[PDB]
Amino acid sequence: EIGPKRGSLVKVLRPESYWYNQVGKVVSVDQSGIRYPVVVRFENQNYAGVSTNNYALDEIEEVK
Amino acid sequence: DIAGLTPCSESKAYNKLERKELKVLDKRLKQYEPGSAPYLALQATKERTENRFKTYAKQGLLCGNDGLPHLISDPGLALRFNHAGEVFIPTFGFLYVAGYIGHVGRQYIILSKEDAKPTDKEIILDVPLALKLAFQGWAWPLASIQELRNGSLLEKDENITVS
Amino acid sequence: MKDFTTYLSTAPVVGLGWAIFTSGLLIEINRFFPDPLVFS
Amino acid sequence: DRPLWYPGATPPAHLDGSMLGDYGFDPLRLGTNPDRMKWFREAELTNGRWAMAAVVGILFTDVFTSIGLVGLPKWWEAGAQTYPIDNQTLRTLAIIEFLLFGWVETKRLYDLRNPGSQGDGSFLGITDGLKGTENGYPGGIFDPLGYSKTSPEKLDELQNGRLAMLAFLGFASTAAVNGQGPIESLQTHLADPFHVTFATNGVSIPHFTEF
Amino acid sequence: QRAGNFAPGSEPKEYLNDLPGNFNFDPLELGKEKGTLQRYREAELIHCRWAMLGAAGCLAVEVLGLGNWYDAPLWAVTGDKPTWFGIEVPFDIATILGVEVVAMAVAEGLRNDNQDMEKRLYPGGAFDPLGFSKDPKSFEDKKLKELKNGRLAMVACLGFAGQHAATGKPILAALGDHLSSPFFNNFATNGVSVPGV
Amino acid sequence: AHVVKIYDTCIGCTQCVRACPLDVLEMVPWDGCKAAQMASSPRTEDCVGCKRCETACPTDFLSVRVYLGNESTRSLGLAY
Numbered sequence A: 001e002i003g004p005k006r007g008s009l010v011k012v013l014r015p016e017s018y019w020y021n022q023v024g025k026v027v028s029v030d031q032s033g034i035r036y037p038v039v040v041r042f043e044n045q046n047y048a049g050v051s052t053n054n055y056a057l058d059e060i061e062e063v064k
Numbered sequence B: 001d002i003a004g005l006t007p008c009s010e011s012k013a014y015n016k017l018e019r020k021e022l023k024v025l026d027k028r029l030k031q032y033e034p035g036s037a038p039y040l041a042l043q044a045t046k047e048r049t050e051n052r053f054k055t056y057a058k059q060g061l062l063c064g065n066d067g068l069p070h071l072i073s074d075p076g077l078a079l080r081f082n083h084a085g086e087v088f089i090p091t092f093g094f095l096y097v098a099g100y101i102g103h104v105g106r107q108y109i110i111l112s113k114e115d116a117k118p119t120d121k122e123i124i125l126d127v128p129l130a131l132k133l134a135f136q137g138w139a140w141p142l143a144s145i146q147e148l149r150n151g152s153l154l155e156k157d158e159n160i161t162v163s
Numbered sequence C: 001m002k003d004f005t006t007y008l009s010t011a012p013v014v015g016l017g018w019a020i021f022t023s024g025l026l027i028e029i030n031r032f033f034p035d036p037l038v039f040s
Numbered sequence D: 001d002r003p004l005w006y007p008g009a010t011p012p013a014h015l016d017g018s019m020l021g022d023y024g025f026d027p028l029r030l031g032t033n034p035d036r037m038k039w040f041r042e043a044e045l046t047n048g049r050w051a052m053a054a055v056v057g058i059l060f061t062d063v064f065t066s067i068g069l070v071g072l073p074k075w076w077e078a079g080a081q082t083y084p085i086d087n088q089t090l091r092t093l094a095i096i097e098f099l100l101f102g103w104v105e106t107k108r109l110y111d112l113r114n115p116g117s118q119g120d121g122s123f124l125g126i127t128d129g130l131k132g133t134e135n136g137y138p139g140g141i142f143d144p145l146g147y148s149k150t151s152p153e154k155l156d157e158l159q160n161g162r163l164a165m166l167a168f169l170g171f172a173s174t175a176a177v178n179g180q181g182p183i184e185s186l187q188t189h190l191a192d193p194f195h196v197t198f199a200t201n202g203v204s205i206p207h208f209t210e211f
Numbered sequence E: 001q002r003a004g005n006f007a008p009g010s011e012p013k014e015y016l017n018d019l020p021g022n023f024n025f026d027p028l029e030l031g032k033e034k035g036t037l038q039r040y041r042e043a044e045l046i047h048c049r050w051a052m053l054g055a056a057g058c059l060a061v062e063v064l065g066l067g068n069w070y071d072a073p074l075w076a077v078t079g080d081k082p083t084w085f086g087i088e089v090p091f092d093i094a095t096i097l098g099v100e101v102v103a104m105a106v107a108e109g110l111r112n113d114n115q116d117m118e119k120r121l122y123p124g125g126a127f128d129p130l131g132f133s134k135d136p137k138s139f140e141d142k143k144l145k146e147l148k149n150g151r152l153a154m155v156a157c158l159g160f161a162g163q164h165a166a167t168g169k170p171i172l173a174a175l176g177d178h179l180s181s182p183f184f185n186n187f188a189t190n191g192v193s194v195p196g197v
Numbered sequence F: 001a002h003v004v005k006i007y008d009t010c011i012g013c014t015q016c017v018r019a020c021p022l023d024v025l026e027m028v029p030w031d032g033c034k035a036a037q038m039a040s041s042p043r044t045e046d047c048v049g050c051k052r053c054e055t056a057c058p059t060d061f062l063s064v065r066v067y068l069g070n071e072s073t074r075s076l077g078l079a080y
């Protein structure tokens, strides 16, 4: 396994993101060398209406 | 007295304003008959007006040169010269009510968010829960300092920032 | 009836009952006890 | 747990545990956090213990007053009777009351924070006696009568103390709408019960129905 | 070396672990940093030592019947000459202000240029000719006496000021009112010390 | 004469390409994503600045940005 576990909650660390210092469920993780593999899903929508986004390994950290 | 203001009892313009406002009704009362309902309505307004003026004078209010009562805000002068009921005491009568509304809404928000689908609980309220909290908030200042001294009031850098 | 009570638990219906309470309370407190300004 | 203030079905959440005068009476749930429940417990005692020793000055004396043995004044006007006396002690009493209590109470405030925390050389030589067995129930203050194993005579201290706290609230309210003392108010309810009450004569409600 | 506790049972403060006059006092954490404490410990001893001399002064004028500490500079406005034990010293007001500044500036400046942290508080040599500081025990003990007595002078010189403003009476006269009628003659009965008496 | 830059976070949705009326954007293969696609902006001379491309990108923050700049006849949408 390369990254966090399925169904595990993680905290985001992108300064650009609407979900920054916020928590979301890990939907999936790809192990094929992609730059932004970690797929995360949040309950709260962003300004557009999207509730998912692919984040990186360094950009996510353990909850709270 | 203070600030060059006379009490409302001793003022002349204050009584002048009373004789004026009653003269308007007496002229208006001449048109109708004694036992009619318009007569009873105006006589009551006359009775209320006579009661409004004497009660404001009895309460140690301060009337200016214009003849209207003025209020004092500093608690020092209010307590020294016996004018506390004007501003200083109602300040605590409000804040008790205002914090009541915050302590109640804050608790309904926290408790509904501990369950599934909190969005539905806002548009479709849980009235049994809302009434429960609304009758449990009589002592909200106790819970606040309890929650402040404990540290479970504020969140700690788990909030979104922008840069 | 379960759905009727749920409709009554919506936001505007509950707000209507609140408004009649706060408004009727303030009015009747001004119907009796007319013209308060100083609190005793 | 002792019996319930409601006989029927008012389940308490955190009062099943041991405590004195536990009747399961906390609707507002102000005793959830145990740290501040520990603080409110001492408050009930200092209000309880103080209120009882206060109610005697109103009660034990006014009984002797109504009978006619002594000519002391009533509590609602005892303060204005002292300072006009020739040999009087004008109001350096508010501040000395605070300078004296401030020394004792902070010694009690620092005990709840650090129990049994009175250093060895801090006081002159009585540092040992000031240590207490528990919070609110110290040792060297009572001379006799605190060596039993069933220590809950404390329940008497609370049921008597909670009761007195109602008394002064009734004395203050009776003495603000009746205009008379507490015992004079009692002699009337006995002589004419239905006429002298909080409803009709004591203006606690706007009752004006003359028909 | 803890002399005591201002509040028995209070939590120890590690920043004051071993110093003269430690009572574990600081509740506002002033002195948490190590460098600022060396400055405060210097300021305390000098605010001390100036108060002790100034305190004995105010008593010396009144004990010997010379006058008040408050009325001492009043000769300037009237124009008469100052006095020391009624000797009629001749100097004028502009002469006092000139010699004081030049003299104390030479003194205070030489003090600041020491750069020996222990001697900035407790110098030696000329400032102690008799040699009490040679004994380390009595030196350590006498340091607590310098500091305990000094804190009395500071708090009490403030009392000479506060007592005077509310009541214009001098020092020993203001004391006599307490002894003659304590319960009646107090700061509470000034009418200015406490609002609402 | 507008500027269009696409960033590393593209995932090959093609929704930007479908939305642009003026055919500024096209898809190019790439090894960074699951879909093995990436956008491109070869012909920005025909860009107009509608920002429909930015509206369609579903990322947390946009993989496509239109930085407006100097104008022209094609950019101002002038039939005349």
Ligand code: CHL
Residues within 6 Å of the ligand: D098, D099, D100, D101, D102, D103, D104, D105, D106, D107, D110, D122, D123, E003, E004, E005, E006, E007, E008, E023
């Ligand atoms: C330098 C500052 C200093 C300060 C700010 C305090 C502050 C405090 N100390 Mg100390 N202390 C200080 C120094 C020291 N304390 C102590 C030893 C103690 C002890 C042992 C205790 C305190 C306590 C207290 C509290 C007293 C509160 C009170 O009643 O005040 C109100 C003001 C006063 C009491 C002053 C009243 C004036 C007065 C003394 C006049 C005396 C003349 C007589 C009245 C004449 C007799 C007339 C008759 C007829 C009545 C308070 C937190 C008590 C406490 O709470 O501990 C936890 C306590 O038990 N302090 C020592 C020796 C080591 C000190 C040395 O510097």
Ligand code: CLA
Residues within 6 Å of the ligand: D166, D167, D169, D170, D171, D173, D174, D177, D178, D185, D186, D188, D189, D196, D197, D198, D199, D201, D202, D203, D204
């Ligand atoms: C708890 C003890 C207590 C007791 C024994 C009394 C007793 C009395 N009060 Mg009283 N009172 C009390 C508390 C108490 N009060 C409190 C806390 C308040 C403030 C809310 C008042 C406010 C008040 C007013 C405004 C008036 C009285 C009056 C009276 C007298 C006539 C009865 C009456 O009006 O109904 C009492 C009415 C109440 C609302 C209080 C009853 C509720 C209590 C808490 C129930 C306690 C249960 C039970 C009685 C306890 C037994 C104790 C006994 C064995 C010693 C009577 C001597 C009237 C008077 O003028 O006296 C001549 C009057 O006008 N009271």
Ligand code: CLA
Residues within 6 Å of the ligand: B122, B123, C010, C011, C012, C013, C014, C015, C016, C019
């Ligand atoms: C009959 C016509 C009618 C009217 C006039 C309204 C009017 C309103 N609806 Mg609405 N609604 C209607 C029919 C109607 N609705 C129908 C048929 C349905 C389907 C069942 C809904 C379902 C519905 C939902 C699900 C919600 C509304 C909400 C609202 C309010 C918008 C939120 C706002 O601005 O307050 C913003 C308010 C605040 C920021 C703070 C709270 C303070 C408020 C103003 C106090 C309460 C106001 C009270 C309801 C006013 C009395 C009713 C008034 C029309 C006379 C607004 C008062 C929303 C709401 O929350 O209502 C309050 C809401 O969530 N409506």
Ligand code: CLA
Residues within 6 Å of the ligand: E006, E016, E019, E020, E021, E022, E023, E024, E025, E026, E030, E031, E037, E040, E041, E042, E043, E044, E047, E151, E152, E154, E155
């Ligand atoms: C300006 C005079 C002054 C200064 C600089 C100090 C400095 C010091 N004292 Mg000290 N002290 C003083 C006067 C002073 N004291 C007086 C008068 C007393 C007797 C009441 C004491 C009693 C005392 C004790 C009992 C202890 C100390 C201790 C200390 C040390 C640690 C605390 C600290 O860093 O405080 C830094 C403090 C300051 C820099 C002063 C700032 C003052 C601010 C601006 C407020 C001033 C206004 C204030 C709120 C009201 C004062 C007036 C009041 C009557 C209303 C430090 C060397 C402790 C220690 O370990 O010493 C070795 C200790 O245990 N002091």
Ligand SMILES: CC(/C=C/C=C(C)/C=C/[C@@]12O[C@]1(C)C[C@@H](O)CC2(C)C)=C\C=C\C=C(C)\C=C\C=C(C)\C=C\[C@@]12O[C@]1(C)C[C@@H](O)CC2(C)C
Residues within 6 Å of the ligand: E025, E026, E027, E028, E029, E030, E047, E048, E050, E051, E052, E053, E054, E055, E057, E058, E068, E069, E070, E071, E072, E073, E153, E154, E155, E157, E158
């Ligand atoms: C400094 C002082 C008091 C200082 C106490 C302080 C700061 C308390 C601080 C704390 O409480 C806190 C804040 C917070 C805690 O974390 C720390 C501590 C430390 C516990 C009093 C006056 C101290 C007084 C001083 C330093 C100076 C005295 C000299 C005088 C009065 C001379 C006057 C004359 O020369 C003339 C002018 C006129 C002539 O007529 C007569 C003579 C006598 C000749």
Ligand code: SF4
Residues within 6 Å of the ligand: F006, F009, F010, F011, F012, F013, F014, F015, F016, F017, F039, F056, F057, F058, F059, F062, F063, F064
């Ligand atoms: S719209 Fe954005 S995320 Fe989607 S394919 Fe185009 S560049 Fe990638």
